[PDB]
Amino acid sequence: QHIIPLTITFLESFRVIEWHKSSDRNSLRFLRGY
RNA sequence: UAUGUGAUGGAACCUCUCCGGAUAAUUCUAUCUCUUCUG
């Protein structure tokens, strides 16, 4: 197979969602911020 | 650490309301100090 590397260089900041359980991955807190 | 024919989340102002305020002449006279030995 062939591998094509990619790089993403952020500039200022970005948003991160927190960890959720497998059974609770369809809540409002997960759908928003997906 | 995703799973793939489908992600406007850049898709949302911690915004709004509240006298560091009130009262006071930089003025002025009565003592202080305890053990003395027969008196």
**To what resolution in angstroms was this structure determined?**
3.2
Q: Which residues fall within 8 angstroms of residue A15, CB to CB, at 6 or more apart?
A: A33
Q: Which residues fall within 8 angstroms of residue A27, CB to CB, at 6 or more apart?
A: A20
Segment holding A11, helix H or strand E: none
d(C-alpha A31, C-alpha A10), whole Å: 24
CA of A8 to C1' of B32 (A): 90
Lookup: nucleotide whose C1' is closest to A11 CA: B10
Name the method of structure determination.
Answer: cryo-EM
Q: Which nucleotides of B are covered by protein (CB under 7 A)?
A: 7, 9-10, 12
| Nearest CA among A2, A34, A5 for reference residue A17 | A34
Instruction: State the DSSP code for A9.
Output: -
